[model samples]
Target: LPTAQEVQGLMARYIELVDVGDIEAIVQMYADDATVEDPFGQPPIHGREQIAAFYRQGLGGGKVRACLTGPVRASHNGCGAMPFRIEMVWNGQPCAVDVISVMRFDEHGRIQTMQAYWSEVNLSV
Candidate 1:
């Protein structure tokens, strides 16, 4: 189990980065070899370049927010991962989606890789 405060802090930072479309901050949060996979397996987004680009495209197109979890789980080992949910308003319609992300953190607890899962149907109009 990971410290609630620590997890919450990280999550808060995540929201901030996503909210502002801060690509630099997002890259800083990942490990060098970080990898991100969306649920559809369209293609896994990897490394700082891919990861940053992913966020850029995502935020540039619309707005999104990770909901304050109905339940949150965090843990640490060689990696750290958190599973949670997020709510989004796309084109002025509210959509709630389930997101389970696995993040790998370094010894210092900084995120190395984060892969999030969500369904298109959940966010579709």
Candidate 2:
């Protein structure tokens, strides 16, 4: 199990990678057989190769930056999840994105799979 700080570090890295559009860096964090879901209600990006591709398209499409974050609901039990409320600027406007991630780790604690859920509640108007 990771300490609170370690979990927090993961969250920070997540935000950083997405903000910088670092696809390779993001993929390196996941386990080999990991799943990533950004846009909800669709087929998640499964496996490292696919996840990498997803990030590539997402990053290439536009810009995003985390403006603020509220408390994170997290846990670690070989498999763990973090539910967070985040605000970011997307397409030149501030919006609220409900981001939750369920992550499974490898033997060395590297993320094996990350099933992410982003709310459809687009706050942009």
Candidate 3:
């Protein structure tokens, strides 16, 4: 199980990687068998290759900017949650999104699964 600081640290580093559009580094943060669900209810993208595909199009676009907007919620569990704000271009207009990510890390502290939660209500143009 990961300590609270480790969990928080993961999310912190994650947002930084996103800010720099380091798609490969971002993928390195996840386990080889990890899964990702963007917006929570969508079908998950499984394994590192698919995860790479997801980020290559999203985080690799060079127009992404993100930062933690709140403290991570982590204590003694392998699961952690953090809120963040992402700024990017949508329809040629700068937009912002308030998103919350729930992450489950493996015993080795690698991210095992992650799901993002947000909606149109959190979107700003």
Candidate 4:
């Protein structure tokens, strides 16, 4: 298990990678069998390949700017949460979403599960 600060550092790195659209690097931050539930209620994507595919398309859209709106929070357990703003284009229109992603790290420090909380109510043009 990681210290709360270590978990916090990883969350910051996660958002940093997202802002740059570094798909490969970000994917590598996960465990081989990690799971990503990118909107909390959706079917989680498991395995590196599946997770890679998800990020590929999400960042494939030309302009992406994922910024942390506040400090990342960490639990005593191997988990952390962060509230952030994702600015990008949605289809033919410019849009953004406010997201709070909670993720758990494995003993090896790789991400095990990531669940993002958000909805249409959190979106803006």
The Cα RMSD of model 4 versus the native structure comes to 0.9
Q: Write down the TM-score of every candidate.
A: 0.70, 0.72, 0.96, 0.96
Q: List runs of model 2 lying over 4 Å from the truth.
A: 78-96
Q: Which ten residues in a row have the lowest lDDT in candidate 2?
A: 65-74
lDDT of each: 0.64, 0.65, 0.91, 0.93
lDDT of 1 by residue, 33-120 (tens): 7777866466777788887887777666556665445434555454334455565666678766766666556656567666676676
Provide the lDDT at 75 for model 1: 54
Q: Which segments of model 1 are wrong by more than 4 Å?
A: 1-5, 78-96
Evaluation by TM-score, superior candidate among 1 and 4: 4
Model 3, span 6-88: residue lDDT tens = 99998889999999988888889999999999989899999999999999888666988999998999868788999999998
Per-prediction CA RMSD (Å): 3.4, 3.2, 0.9, 0.9
Model 2 TM-score (2 dp):
0.72
Report RMSD for candidate 1. 3.4
How are the candidates ranked when ordered by lDDT, highest leading?
A: 4, 3, 2, 1
Candidate 3 runs further than 4 Å off: none
Clashes found in each candidate (C-alpha, N, C closer than 3 A)? 2, 2, 0, 0
For model 4, the stretches where C-alpha displacement exceeds 4 angstroms are none
Please give the lDDT score at residue 109 for candidate 4. 94
